[PDB]
Design an enzyme around this catalytic site. Structure first.
Site, PDB file in Angstrom:
ATOM      1  N   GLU A   1      -5.023   2.939 -10.908  1.00  0.00           N
ATOM      2  CA  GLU A   1      -5.813   1.647 -10.648  1.00  0.00           C
ATOM      3  C   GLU A   1      -6.743   1.468 -11.655  1.00  0.00           C
ATOM      4  O   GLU A   1      -7.014   0.221 -12.102  1.00  0.00           O
ATOM      5  CB  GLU A   1      -6.179   1.630  -9.225  1.00  0.00           C
TER       6      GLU A   1
ATOM      7  N   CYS B   1       0.738  -1.252   0.131  1.00  0.00           N
ATOM      8  CA  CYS B   1       0.161   0.046  -0.147  1.00  0.00           C
ATOM      9  C   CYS B   1       0.750   1.241   0.062  1.00  0.00           C
ATOM     10  O   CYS B   1       1.593   1.477   0.998  1.00  0.00           O
ATOM     11  CB  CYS B   1      -0.909   0.012   1.166  1.00  0.00           C
TER      12      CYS B   1
ATOM     13  N   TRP C   1      -9.191   5.509  -1.044  1.00  0.00           N
ATOM     14  CA  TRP C   1      -9.703   5.987  -2.152  1.00  0.00           C
ATOM     15  C   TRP C   1      -8.847   5.661  -3.051  1.00  0.00           C
ATOM     16  O   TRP C   1      -7.730   5.163  -3.008  1.00  0.00           O
ATOM     17  CB  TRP C   1      -9.750   7.809  -2.066  1.00  0.00           C
TER      18      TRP C   1
HETATM   19  C1  HEM Z   1      -6.196   6.176   1.743  1.00  0.00           C
HETATM   20  C2  HEM Z   1      -6.135   5.805   0.489  1.00  0.00           C
HETATM   21  C3  HEM Z   1      -5.607   4.715   0.168  1.00  0.00           C
HETATM   22  C4  HEM Z   1      -4.736   4.636  -1.017  1.00  0.00           C
HETATM   23  C5  HEM Z   1      -4.366   5.897  -2.154  1.00  0.00           C
HETATM   24  C6  HEM Z   1      -4.240   3.358  -1.384  1.00  0.00           C
HETATM   25  C7  HEM Z   1      -3.753   2.884  -2.444  1.00  0.00           C
HETATM   26  C8  HEM Z   1      -3.148   1.722  -2.734  1.00  0.00           C
HETATM   27  C9  HEM Z   1      -2.878   0.975  -4.046  1.00  0.00           C
HETATM   28  C10 HEM Z   1      -2.580   1.822  -5.271  1.00  0.00           C
HETATM   29  C11 HEM Z   1      -2.692  -0.402  -3.780  1.00  0.00           C
HETATM   30  C12 HEM Z   1      -2.545  -1.393  -5.073  1.00  0.00           C
HETATM   31  C13 HEM Z   1      -3.795  -1.967  -5.615  1.00  0.00           C
HETATM   32  C14 HEM Z   1      -3.601  -2.791  -6.813  1.00  0.00           C
HETATM   33  O1  HEM Z   1      -2.642  -2.541  -7.517  1.00  0.00           O
HETATM   34  O2  HEM Z   1      -4.415  -3.504  -6.959  1.00  0.00           O
HETATM   35  C15 HEM Z   1      -3.114  -0.535  -2.403  1.00  0.00           C
HETATM   36  C16 HEM Z   1      -2.968  -1.627  -1.966  1.00  0.00           C
HETATM   37  C17 HEM Z   1      -3.387  -2.373  -0.591  1.00  0.00           C
HETATM   38  N1  HEM Z   1      -3.729  -1.261   0.587  1.00  0.00           N
HETATM   39 FE1  HEM Z   1      -4.005   0.610   0.031  1.00  0.00          FE
HETATM   40  N2  HEM Z   1      -4.713   2.535  -0.419  1.00  0.00           N
HETATM   41  C18 HEM Z   1      -5.363   3.205   0.532  1.00  0.00           C
HETATM   42  C19 HEM Z   1      -6.425   2.782   1.681  1.00  0.00           C
HETATM   43  C20 HEM Z   1      -6.133   1.496   2.207  1.00  0.00           C
HETATM   44  C21 HEM Z   1      -6.677   1.051   3.452  1.00  0.00           C
HETATM   45  C22 HEM Z   1      -7.847   2.094   4.005  1.00  0.00           C
HETATM   46  C23 HEM Z   1      -6.298  -0.156   3.705  1.00  0.00           C
HETATM   47  C24 HEM Z   1      -6.604  -0.911   4.963  1.00  0.00           C
HETATM   48  C25 HEM Z   1      -7.136  -0.711   6.026  1.00  0.00           C
HETATM   49  C26 HEM Z   1      -5.318  -0.619   2.843  1.00  0.00           C
HETATM   50  C27 HEM Z   1      -4.726  -1.861   2.474  1.00  0.00           C
HETATM   51  C28 HEM Z   1      -3.830  -2.035   1.410  1.00  0.00           C
HETATM   52  C29 HEM Z   1      -3.804  -3.570   1.184  1.00  0.00           C
HETATM   53  C30 HEM Z   1      -3.814  -4.805   2.240  1.00  0.00           C
HETATM   54  C31 HEM Z   1      -3.029  -3.496  -0.035  1.00  0.00           C
HETATM   55  C32 HEM Z   1      -2.916  -4.977  -1.038  1.00  0.00           C
HETATM   56  C33 HEM Z   1      -4.160  -5.470  -1.624  1.00  0.00           C
HETATM   57  C34 HEM Z   1      -3.837  -6.716  -2.489  1.00  0.00           C
HETATM   58  O3  HEM Z   1      -2.807  -7.413  -2.083  1.00  0.00           O
HETATM   59  O4  HEM Z   1      -4.499  -7.022  -3.259  1.00  0.00           O
HETATM   60  N3  HEM Z   1      -5.148   0.546   2.007  1.00  0.00           N
HETATM   61  N4  HEM Z   1      -3.412   0.567  -1.856  1.00  0.00           N
HETATM   62  N1  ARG Z   2      -6.993   2.590  -3.324  1.00  0.00           N
HETATM   63  C1  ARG Z   2      -7.247   1.289  -2.856  1.00  0.00           C
HETATM   64  N2  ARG Z   2      -7.326   1.332  -1.614  1.00  0.00           N
HETATM   65  N3  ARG Z   2      -7.162   0.312  -3.745  1.00  0.00           N
HETATM   66  C2  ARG Z   2      -7.472  -1.083  -3.398  1.00  0.00           C
HETATM   67  C3  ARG Z   2      -7.463  -2.083  -4.634  1.00  0.00           C
HETATM   68  C4  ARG Z   2      -8.339  -1.618  -5.482  1.00  0.00           C
HETATM   69  C5  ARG Z   2      -7.877  -2.216  -7.256  1.00  0.00           C
HETATM   70  N4  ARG Z   2      -6.698  -1.938  -7.538  1.00  0.00           N
HETATM   71  C6  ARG Z   2      -9.040  -1.648  -8.132  1.00  0.00           C
HETATM   72  O1  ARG Z   2      -8.584  -0.974  -9.176  1.00  0.00           O
HETATM   73  O2  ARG Z   2     -10.258  -1.754  -8.015  1.00  0.00           O
END
Ligand code: HEM
Ligand code: ARG
Ligand code: HEM
Ligand code: THG
Ligand code: THG
Ligand code: ARG
Lengths: 361, 361
Positions: free
Chosen positions: A241, A66, A236
Site C-alpha cells: 500500500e 479487504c 495495519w
Molecule cells: C488487520 C489488518 C488489515 C489489513 C492487512 C488490511 C488490508 C487491506 C488492503 C490491502 C486493502 C486495500 C487498500 C487499498 O488498496 O487502498 C484493504 C481495504 C479495505 N479494508 Fe482492510 N485491512 C485490514 C483491516 C481492516 C479493518 C480493521 C477493516 C474494517 C473494520 C477493514 C476494511 C476494509 C475496507 C472496507 C476496505 C476497502 C476500502 C476502500 O474501498 O477504499 N480493513 N484492506
Molecule cells: N491496511 C489497511 N487497513 N488499509 C486501508 C487503506 C489504506 C490506503 N491504501 C493507504 O495506502 O493509506
C-alpha cells in the site's frame, strides 16, 4: 413512508443473523417486538453494545476489497455514541489514534459515533484518513490525492508548512453547524517511520517516510438499516500500500525513478525492468523500516496466506465467500499468490462499509 | 431452422461493418443478395479473400484479453480453405510455424482452415498451441498444463523422451475419421531460446529454455455467422508470459525457489520479498535471452505503452473500446502501467476468437 419500511426489513434480517452467530436464537422474538415499537415511536432504533460490536465485525468480514479479513473477530469496538460536542469528537478521534497505534503493536479498531436519525448526520468526518499528508499544486508538493481536502482545510483557516509530509488536521462537522471545524494533530500522537533499506545505505538520501496507522474515516457503516456515517476504522498496513502505491504511483509520490538512481541501476531501458527492480527494493525497504521501529506491518505473501485461511474458515462456518479480485490481488507479484489463480463473487452482503459522497467536492 | 436465421443476421451485421471500414459502402446491397441466395441453396456462404482477411483483423481488434492489439491491421492472413487431406493440414501447419517465425523476426499470422458447414468440423486441431511442451506425472516432469493432451497423444501411439521440454506432436482430426492423427515436429522448424542472465553467470545452471512463437491453435474464429473452429494464430511473446507465468506458477514449472538460489538470495522469509526479486531477475533474463538470439519479444511496460496508443486510435476512429482488465494487467508490476489505473468494458463484440470444448477432456 418507504424509509420506515426499508429500516424494518434490514433490522429483521440483521437481528436474526446476528443472534444466530452469537447463540441467542430464542432472544430474537422479544428483541424484534421492542424494535418495531421503537421505529413507530421515534422513527429509528438504538443497537445494544453487543449488536453493533458484532455488526462492525460482520461488516469487516463482508468487505470484498479487504485481504486482512482473517482477523475480523478480534476487532476492538469503541462505543462513542455518547458524543455531543466538537470537543467530544476530537477527544474520541485522538483516543482512537492512541489506542489503535498502541506504541507500534497496532490493534484493529473502530470508533462508533452517533448514526443518522432522519437522513441527517450528527457528526460528519471530512478526512479520508485521520492521519494523512497534505497536497499542493509551479510544481507538485505533497500528496496529490489530498489536494481537494487540503484546499477545503485552507478555506477554513488552516495553513500547512508546504513540505512533502504536512499532517492534515482533523476536520469534521457537527449537526447544527453550516461549516466544519478543524484541529491540528499533536506530533506525539502520530507515529511516523523513516524509510531505510537493509543493504543499501544510500536509501536514506531519498528522505522518505510514512505514517504508521491507516485509519479510514470517510466510509459509512451500515448495520441493520442504521447508517453510521461516522465510524473510523483501522487495521495495519500491508507493505505494498505504501511501497507499490503511495510512494510509487505516478499520480502519488512518483518515487520509482529516484529509487532506481539510489540503488545504482539505469533508467534508460524498459527491457532492463528498472521499475520492477525499484519496486522490489522500495517494498523491501518499507517492510524492514516498519519492523525495525516495531510498527506492525504485513507483506503481501503472508497476507495472502492469511487470507487463504479466511476462505477455509468461512466454508467451515457455512458462509458464502464474497470478494473483489481487482482489489484483493497485490500490486506487485500478484501471480505468486493464490488470489490471482481463483475467482470470487463480488456480491454486496450487509452489514458492510460503503463509500459516501465527499462534502468538499 | 433457427440456425439459418442466426447465420443471416450475423452476415448482415458483418458485411455492412466490414465494407464500411474498407470504403465499399455501395457494394453492400449486391453482396447481401448473393449471400441470401447462397444460404437458401447450400445452408452457408463462402467469404471473399478480402472479407475473412479483414474479419480476422477485426477479431483481433475485438479481443478483450489481448494487450498487443495496436498491431491489428498488420496481421498476415494465410488462406488455407483449400485443404482436403491430413497431409495438406500438416503442410499448412508446418508452413505457419516457418513463416510466422521468420528466422526470429516474428510476423503476426493466422492460417484459415475450412469452417464448419452443418455444425460439423472439417479440420479439428487438438493442440492448445502448435508448439508446446509435454507434461507427465512419482514426481512431476514437463509442463503440468499439458498433461491431458500428452495423455491423449500417448493413447494414439506417440511417446516422449520424458525430459522437461519434450515437443508435443501436431495432433488433429479430419472429417470422416473417428480418431485424430499425429505428426512429430521437425527440430529445424522450432526455434528455442536458452535462458541466460546479463549479469549473473550462474543462471545457465538452471538449464531453462522456452520456444520462440506462441501459436494458439484451439480457438474458434467467428466471422459473420461462419464458425472457423480451426484458425491458428500467433503474435510474439510478452516477456511476462514466460518469466512470470510459464516458468513461475506453482502449477507450471515452479522455478522461483531455484531462481532465488542461483541469484544468491535466501528463501527464508516472506518479508525479504525473495519471490519478487526472483521474478524480476527471471523476467530480465527472458527479455535479454530472446533479444540476444534475435527472437521478437516485448516487455510489459512497452506493451502497455503500445496498448495506450491503441486506446487513443480507437477513440479517434470512432469505435468503442472493449477490454478485460483481469487479463490486460501484467502479472508483475501492474500498477506501473496505465492499464491498472483505468476501467474497461468487458463486452463481447463480434467478429472475435472464442474458447471451444476440448475433445480430449
Ligand atoms: C488487520 C489488518 C488489515 C489489513 C492487512 C488490511 C488490508 C487491506 C488492503 C490491502 C486493502 C486495500 C487498500 C487499498 O488498496 O487502498 C484493504 C481495504 C479495505 N479494508 Fe482492510 N485491512 C485490514 C483491516 C481492516 C479493518 C480493521 C477493516 C474494517 C473494520 C477493514 C476494511 C476494509 C475496507 C472496507 C476496505 C476497502 C476500502 C476502500 O474501498 O477504499 N480493513 N484492506
Ligand atoms: N491496511 C489497511 N487497513 N488499509 C486501508 C487503506 C489504506 C490506503 N491504501 C493507504 O495506502 O493509506
Ligand atoms: C503482436 C503481438 C501480440 C502480443 C504482444 C500479444 C499479447 C497477449 C497477451 C499478453 C495475452 C495474455 C496471454 C495469457 O495470459 O495467457 C494475449 C491474449 C490473447 N491474444 Fe494477443 N498478443 C499478440 C498477438 C495476438 C494475435 C496475432 C491475435 C489474434 C489474431 C491475438 C489474440 C489474443 C486472444 C484471443 C487472447 C486471449 C487468449 C486466451 O483467452 O487464452 N493476440 N495476447
Ligand atoms: N494475462 C493473464 N491474466 C490472467 C490470467 C492469464 O492466464 N493471463 N489468468 C487468470 C486466472 N483466472 C481467472 C479468470 C477470471 C477471474 C475473474 O473474473 N475474477 C474476478 C472478477 C471480480 C470482480 O469482478 O470483482 C472474480 O473474482 O470473479 C479471476 C481469475 C487471471 N488473470
Ligand atoms: N488493492 C487495490 N487494488 C486496486 C486499486 C486500489 O486502490 N487498491 N485501485 C484500482 C484502480 N481502479 C479500478 C477500479 C475498478 C476496476 C474495474 O472494475 N475494472 C475492470 C473489470 C473488468 C472485468 O470485469 O473484466 C474493468 O475494466 O471494468 C478497474 C480499476 C485497481 N485495483
Ligand atoms: N503473446 C501471445 N500472443 N500469447 C498468447 C498466449 C501464450 C501463453 N500465454 C504462453 O505463455 O504460452
Amino acid at each position: 413512508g418507504s424509509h420506515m419500511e426499508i429500516l424494518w426489513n434490514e433490522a429483521k434480517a440483521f437481528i436474526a443473523e446476528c443472534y444466530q452467530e452469537l447463540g441467542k436464537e430464542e432472544e430474537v422474538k422479544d428483541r424484534l417486538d421492542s424494535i418495531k415499537s421503537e421505529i413507530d415511536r421515534t422513527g429509528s432504533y438504538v443497537h445494544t453494545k453487543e449488536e453493533l460490536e458484532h455488526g462492525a465485525k460482520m461488516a469487516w468480514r463482508n468487505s470484498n476489497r479487504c485481504i486482512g479479513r482473517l482477523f475480523w473477530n478480534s476487532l476492538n469496538v469503541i462505543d462513542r455514541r455518547d458524543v455531543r460536542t466538537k470537543e467530544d469528537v476530537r477527544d474520541a478521534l485522538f483516543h482512537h489514534i492512541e489506542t489503535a497505534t498502541n506504541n507500534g503493536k497496532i490493534r484493529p479498531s473502530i470508533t462508533i459515533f452517533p448514526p443518522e436519525e432522519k437522513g441527517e448526520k450528527q457528526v460528519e468526518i471530512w478526512n479520508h484518513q485521520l492521519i494523512r499528508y497534505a497536497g499542493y499544486e509551479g510544481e507538485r508538493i505533497g500528496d496529490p490525492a489530498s489536494r481537494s481536502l487540503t484546499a477545503a482545510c485552507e478555506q477554513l483557516g488552516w495553513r500547512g508548512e508546504r513540505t512533502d509530509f504536512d499532517l492534515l488536521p482533523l476536520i469534521f462537522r457537527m449537526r447544527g453547524d453550516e461549516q466544519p471545524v478543524w484541529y491540528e494533530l499533536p506530533r506525539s500522537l502520530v507515529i511516523e517511520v523513516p524509510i531505510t533499506h537493509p543493504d543499501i545505505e544510500a536509501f536514506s538520501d531519498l528522505e522518505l517516510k510514512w505514517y504508521g496507522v491507516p485509519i479510514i474515516s470517510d466510509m459509512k457503516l451500515e448495520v441493520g438499516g442504521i447508517h453510521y456515517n461516522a465510524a473510523p476504522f483501522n487495521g495495519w498496513y500491508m507493505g505494498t500500500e505504501i511501497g507499490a502505491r503511495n510512494l510509487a504511483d505516478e499520480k502519488r509520490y512518483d518515487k520509482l525513478k529516484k529509487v532506481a538512481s539510489v540503488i545504482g541501476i539505469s533508467t534508460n531501458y524498459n527491457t532492463d525492468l528498472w521499475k520492477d527492480q525499484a519496486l522490489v527494493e522500495l517494498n523491501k525497504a518499507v517492510l524492514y523500516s516498519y519492523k525495525k521501529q516495531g510498527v506492525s506491518i504485513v507483506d503481501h505473501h503472508t497476507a495472502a496466506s492469511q487470507f487463504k485461511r479466511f476462505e477455509e474458515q468461512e466454508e467451515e462456518a457455512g458462509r458464502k465467500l464474497t470478494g473483489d479480485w481487482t482489489w484483493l490481488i497485490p500490486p506487485i507479484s500478484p501471480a505468486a499468490t493464490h488470489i490471482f489463480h481463483r475467482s470470487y463473487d463480488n456480491s454486496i452482503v450487509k452489514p458492510n462499509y460503503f463509500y459516501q459522497d465527499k462534502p468538499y467536492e
